[PDB]
Tab-separated table of N, CA, C and O in Angstrom:
chain	number	residue	atom	x	y	z
A	854	UNK	N	0.835	-1.195	0.000
A	854	UNK	CA	0.000	0.000	0.000
A	854	UNK	C	0.871	1.245	0.000
A	854	UNK	O	0.597	2.213	-0.720
A	855	UNK	N	1.934	1.246	0.806
A	855	UNK	CA	2.784	2.432	0.861
A	855	UNK	C	3.466	2.699	-0.477
A	855	UNK	O	3.512	3.846	-0.934
A	856	UNK	N	4.003	1.661	-1.122
A	856	UNK	CA	4.740	1.893	-2.364
A	856	UNK	C	3.796	2.330	-3.478
A	856	UNK	O	4.158	3.159	-4.322
A	857	UNK	N	2.577	1.783	-3.508
A	857	UNK	CA	1.696	2.033	-4.646
A	857	UNK	C	1.391	3.518	-4.813
A	857	UNK	O	1.397	4.035	-5.936
A	858	UNK	N	1.120	4.221	-3.712
A	858	UNK	CA	0.701	5.616	-3.821
A	858	UNK	C	1.786	6.474	-4.461
A	858	UNK	O	1.498	7.305	-5.329
A	859	UNK	N	3.034	6.288	-4.046
A	859	UNK	CA	4.141	7.069	-4.586
A	859	UNK	C	4.457	6.641	-6.014
A	859	UNK	O	3.857	7.137	-6.968
A	860	UNK	N	-1.733	14.312	-12.628
A	860	UNK	CA	-2.779	14.820	-11.748
A	860	UNK	C	-3.393	16.099	-12.314
A	860	UNK	O	-4.612	16.219	-12.419
A	861	UNK	N	-2.531	17.054	-12.671
A	861	UNK	CA	-3.009	18.318	-13.225
A	861	UNK	C	-3.678	18.119	-14.581
A	861	UNK	O	-4.721	18.726	-14.863
A	862	UNK	N	-3.091	17.281	-15.438
A	862	UNK	CA	-3.667	17.054	-16.760
A	862	UNK	C	-5.035	16.400	-16.638
A	862	UNK	O	-5.942	16.680	-17.430
A	863	UNK	N	-5.209	15.514	-15.656
A	863	UNK	CA	-6.517	14.905	-15.446
A	863	UNK	C	-7.553	15.955	-15.070
A	863	UNK	O	-8.683	15.932	-15.571
A	864	UNK	N	-7.185	16.891	-14.191
A	864	UNK	CA	-8.103	17.964	-13.827
A	864	UNK	C	-8.451	18.820	-15.040
A	864	UNK	O	-9.623	19.151	-15.265
A	865	UNK	N	-7.444	19.177	-15.842
A	865	UNK	CA	-7.703	19.981	-17.034
A	865	UNK	C	-8.643	19.257	-17.991
A	865	UNK	O	-9.601	19.849	-18.506
A	866	UNK	N	-8.388	17.969	-18.232
A	866	UNK	CA	-9.212	17.204	-19.162
A	866	UNK	C	-10.641	17.069	-18.651
A	866	UNK	O	-11.600	17.204	-19.422
A	867	UNK	N	-10.803	16.786	-17.356
A	867	UNK	CA	-12.144	16.665	-16.795
A	867	UNK	C	-12.898	17.981	-16.903
A	867	UNK	O	-14.087	17.998	-17.248
A	868	UNK	N	-12.226	19.098	-16.612
A	868	UNK	CA	-12.880	20.395	-16.737
A	868	UNK	C	-13.311	20.652	-18.175
A	868	UNK	O	-14.430	21.116	-18.421
A	869	UNK	N	-12.440	20.346	-19.139
A	869	UNK	CA	-12.787	20.570	-20.539
A	869	UNK	C	-13.985	19.719	-20.949
A	869	UNK	O	-14.912	20.205	-21.611
A	870	UNK	N	-13.983	18.441	-20.564
A	870	UNK	CA	-15.087	17.560	-20.934
A	870	UNK	C	-16.396	18.021	-20.306
A	870	UNK	O	-17.443	18.033	-20.967
A	871	UNK	N	-16.360	18.402	-19.026
A	871	UNK	CA	-17.573	18.872	-18.365
A	871	UNK	C	-18.090	20.149	-19.013
A	871	UNK	O	-19.301	20.315	-19.196
A	872	UNK	N	-17.185	21.068	-19.365
A	872	UNK	CA	-17.608	22.295	-20.029
A	872	UNK	C	-18.245	21.996	-21.380
A	872	UNK	O	-19.261	22.599	-21.741
A	873	UNK	N	-17.659	21.070	-22.143
A	873	UNK	CA	-18.240	20.712	-23.434
A	873	UNK	C	-19.628	20.106	-23.263
A	873	UNK	O	-20.556	20.435	-24.014
A	874	UNK	N	-19.789	19.214	-22.282
A	874	UNK	CA	-21.099	18.610	-22.047
A	874	UNK	C	-22.124	19.661	-21.638
A	874	UNK	O	-23.271	19.640	-22.107
A	875	UNK	N	-21.734	20.585	-20.758
A	875	UNK	CA	-22.648	21.642	-20.340
A	875	UNK	C	-23.028	22.534	-21.515
A	875	UNK	O	-24.188	22.942	-21.643
A	876	UNK	N	-22.061	22.855	-22.377
A	876	UNK	CA	-22.359	23.665	-23.553
A	876	UNK	C	-23.326	22.944	-24.482
A	876	UNK	O	-24.242	23.561	-25.036
A	877	UNK	N	-23.136	21.637	-24.670
A	877	UNK	CA	-24.069	20.880	-25.488
A	877	UNK	C	-25.470	20.868	-24.906
A	877	UNK	O	-26.458	21.022	-25.631
A	878	UNK	N	-25.575	20.685	-23.588
A	878	UNK	CA	-26.886	20.712	-22.944
A	878	UNK	C	-27.543	22.080	-23.094
A	878	UNK	O	-28.749	22.176	-23.350
A	879	UNK	N	-26.762	23.152	-22.935
A	879	UNK	CA	-27.308	24.495	-23.099
A	879	UNK	C	-27.768	24.729	-24.532
A	879	UNK	O	-28.802	25.366	-24.763
A	880	UNK	N	-27.006	24.232	-25.508
A	880	UNK	CA	-27.416	24.359	-26.902
A	880	UNK	C	-28.715	23.606	-27.159
A	880	UNK	O	-29.596	24.097	-27.875
A	881	UNK	N	-28.849	22.406	-26.588
A	881	UNK	CA	-30.095	21.659	-26.732
A	881	UNK	C	-31.262	22.418	-26.114
A	881	UNK	O	-32.354	22.479	-26.694
A	882	UNK	N	-31.051	23.006	-24.935
A	882	UNK	CA	-32.111	23.773	-24.287
A	882	UNK	C	-32.502	24.971	-25.145
A	882	UNK	O	-33.690	25.279	-25.306
A	883	UNK	N	-31.510	25.670	-25.701
A	883	UNK	CA	-31.801	26.819	-26.553
A	883	UNK	C	-32.573	26.398	-27.796
A	883	UNK	O	-33.515	27.082	-28.213
A	884	UNK	N	-32.187	25.275	-28.405
A	884	UNK	CA	-32.924	24.773	-29.560
A	884	UNK	C	-34.363	24.445	-29.184
A	884	UNK	O	-35.292	24.714	-29.954
A	885	UNK	N	-34.564	23.860	-28.001
A	885	UNK	CA	-35.921	23.602	-27.531
A	885	UNK	C	-36.702	24.902	-27.378
A	885	UNK	O	-37.885	24.971	-27.732
A	886	UNK	N	-36.055	25.943	-26.852
A	886	UNK	CA	-36.724	27.233	-26.699
A	886	UNK	C	-37.116	27.792	-28.060
A	886	UNK	O	-38.235	28.285	-28.247
A	887	UNK	N	-36.207	27.727	-29.028
A	887	UNK	CA	-36.477	28.227	-30.371
A	887	UNK	C	-37.088	27.134	-31.242
A	887	UNK	O	-38.285	27.156	-31.532
B	725	UNK	N	6.948	34.297	10.435
B	725	UNK	CA	6.312	34.802	9.225
B	725	UNK	C	7.137	34.425	8.005
B	725	UNK	O	6.595	34.011	6.974
B	726	UNK	N	8.461	34.562	8.099
B	726	UNK	CA	9.293	34.239	6.944
B	726	UNK	C	9.205	32.761	6.581
B	726	UNK	O	9.084	32.415	5.401
B	727	UNK	N	9.264	31.869	7.573
B	727	UNK	CA	9.270	30.441	7.255
B	727	UNK	C	7.918	30.007	6.701
B	727	UNK	O	7.848	29.149	5.813
B	728	UNK	N	6.825	30.580	7.213
B	728	UNK	CA	5.502	30.081	6.845
B	728	UNK	C	5.252	30.187	5.345
B	728	UNK	O	4.713	29.257	4.734
B	729	UNK	N	5.633	31.309	4.731
B	729	UNK	CA	5.311	31.517	3.322
B	729	UNK	C	5.964	30.460	2.441
B	729	UNK	O	5.326	29.918	1.531
B	730	UNK	N	7.233	30.155	2.692
B	730	UNK	CA	7.952	29.169	1.895
B	730	UNK	C	7.459	27.760	2.207
B	730	UNK	O	6.487	27.287	1.617
B	731	UNK	N	-0.737	25.788	-6.150
B	731	UNK	CA	-1.144	27.112	-6.607
B	731	UNK	C	-1.877	27.024	-7.945
B	731	UNK	O	-2.966	27.573	-8.103
B	732	UNK	N	-1.262	26.330	-8.906
B	732	UNK	CA	-1.873	26.181	-10.223
B	732	UNK	C	-3.156	25.360	-10.157
B	732	UNK	O	-4.153	25.695	-10.812
B	733	UNK	N	-3.149	24.274	-9.381
B	733	UNK	CA	-4.338	23.431	-9.282
B	733	UNK	C	-5.487	24.204	-8.654
B	733	UNK	O	-6.652	24.017	-9.023
B	734	UNK	N	-5.188	25.080	-7.692
B	734	UNK	CA	-6.238	25.900	-7.100
B	734	UNK	C	-6.862	26.820	-8.139
B	734	UNK	O	-8.087	26.977	-8.187
B	735	UNK	N	-6.032	27.436	-8.987
B	735	UNK	CA	-6.561	28.287	-10.048
B	735	UNK	C	-7.426	27.484	-11.013
B	735	UNK	O	-8.522	27.920	-11.391
B	736	UNK	N	-6.956	26.299	-11.411
B	736	UNK	CA	-7.737	25.465	-12.321
B	736	UNK	C	-9.080	25.093	-11.704
B	736	UNK	O	-10.126	25.186	-12.362
B	737	UNK	N	-9.072	24.677	-10.435
B	737	UNK	CA	-10.305	24.266	-9.774
B	737	UNK	C	-11.272	25.434	-9.631
B	737	UNK	O	-12.479	25.281	-9.855
B	738	UNK	N	-10.762	26.606	-9.243
B	738	UNK	CA	-11.627	27.772	-9.108
B	738	UNK	C	-12.241	28.151	-10.445
B	738	UNK	O	-13.434	28.472	-10.522
B	739	UNK	N	-11.444	28.117	-11.517
B	739	UNK	CA	-11.983	28.427	-12.836
B	739	UNK	C	-13.075	27.439	-13.225
B	739	UNK	O	-14.128	27.837	-13.737
B	740	UNK	N	-12.846	26.147	-12.981
B	740	UNK	CA	-13.850	25.146	-13.332
B	740	UNK	C	-15.141	25.366	-12.549
B	740	UNK	O	-16.242	25.311	-13.113
B	741	UNK	N	-15.024	25.617	-11.243
B	741	UNK	CA	-16.215	25.821	-10.424
B	741	UNK	C	-16.981	27.063	-10.863
B	741	UNK	O	-18.216	27.042	-10.957
B	742	UNK	N	-16.266	28.160	-11.133
B	742	UNK	CA	-16.932	29.379	-11.575
B	742	UNK	C	-17.624	29.172	-12.914
B	742	UNK	O	-18.742	29.654	-13.125
B	743	UNK	N	-16.972	28.457	-13.837
B	743	UNK	CA	-17.595	28.185	-15.126
B	743	UNK	C	-18.854	27.344	-14.959
B	743	UNK	O	-19.870	27.598	-15.615
B	744	UNK	N	-18.807	26.335	-14.087
B	744	UNK	CA	-19.992	25.513	-13.856
B	744	UNK	C	-21.130	26.341	-13.271
B	744	UNK	O	-22.288	26.202	-13.686
B	745	UNK	N	-20.821	27.208	-12.303
B	745	UNK	CA	-21.858	28.051	-11.715
B	745	UNK	C	-22.456	28.995	-12.752
B	745	UNK	O	-23.679	29.187	-12.799
B	746	UNK	N	-21.608	29.599	-13.587
B	746	UNK	CA	-22.105	30.492	-14.628
B	746	UNK	C	-22.977	29.740	-15.625
B	746	UNK	O	-24.008	30.257	-16.071
B	747	UNK	N	-22.573	28.524	-15.995
B	747	UNK	CA	-23.380	27.723	-16.909
B	747	UNK	C	-24.733	27.388	-16.294
B	747	UNK	O	-25.761	27.428	-16.978
B	748	UNK	N	-24.753	27.051	-15.004
B	748	UNK	CA	-26.021	26.791	-14.343
B	748	UNK	C	-26.919	28.014	-14.315
B	748	UNK	O	-28.127	27.917	-14.555
B	749	UNK	N	-26.342	29.182	-14.024
B	749	UNK	CA	-27.130	30.412	-14.028
B	749	UNK	C	-27.679	30.707	-15.420
B	749	UNK	O	-28.836	31.120	-15.568
B	750	UNK	N	-26.860	30.502	-16.455
B	750	UNK	CA	-27.323	30.726	-17.820
B	750	UNK	C	-28.438	29.756	-18.187
B	750	UNK	O	-29.400	30.132	-18.866
B	751	UNK	N	-28.322	28.498	-17.756
B	751	UNK	CA	-29.383	27.530	-18.012
B	751	UNK	C	-30.675	27.938	-17.315
B	751	UNK	O	-31.764	27.814	-17.887
B	752	UNK	N	-30.573	28.422	-16.075
B	752	UNK	CA	-31.761	28.900	-15.374
B	752	UNK	C	-32.391	30.079	-16.106
B	752	UNK	O	-33.619	30.154	-16.243
B	753	UNK	N	-31.565	31.012	-16.586
B	753	UNK	CA	-32.088	32.160	-17.321
B	753	UNK	C	-32.785	31.702	-18.597
B	753	UNK	O	-33.863	32.199	-18.947
B	754	UNK	N	-32.178	30.756	-19.316
B	754	UNK	CA	-32.791	30.248	-20.540
B	754	UNK	C	-34.118	29.563	-20.246
B	754	UNK	O	-35.092	29.737	-20.987
B	755	UNK	N	-34.175	28.776	-19.170
B	755	UNK	CA	-35.431	28.142	-18.786
B	755	UNK	C	-36.489	29.190	-18.463
B	755	UNK	O	-37.662	29.030	-18.820
B	756	UNK	N	-36.091	30.268	-17.786
B	756	UNK	CA	-37.026	31.357	-17.522
B	756	UNK	C	-37.529	31.971	-18.822
B	756	UNK	O	-38.718	32.286	-18.951
B	757	UNK	N	-36.638	32.147	-19.799
B	757	UNK	CA	-37.045	32.701	-21.087
B	757	UNK	C	-38.045	31.777	-21.770
B	757	UNK	O	-39.066	32.227	-22.304
B	758	UNK	N	-37.772	30.476	-21.764
B	758	UNK	CA	-38.661	29.500	-22.384
B	758	UNK	C	-39.704	29.009	-21.385
B	758	UNK	O	-40.874	29.383	-21.461
């Protein structure tokens, strides 16, 4: 357990993916409105 | 004081959280419009 444990790019990628998904959802909502 | 003082991930996380909050507010505004 001690040896196994011994990051930023994962955070960047997750943020980008979440932003893209949110933008897609917002675009779908806008299309529904229009 | 000198010893205590001696970052990027915090900036990334704050940006992601602020973007998510802004997207949620925009979605709420769009729902109000529609």
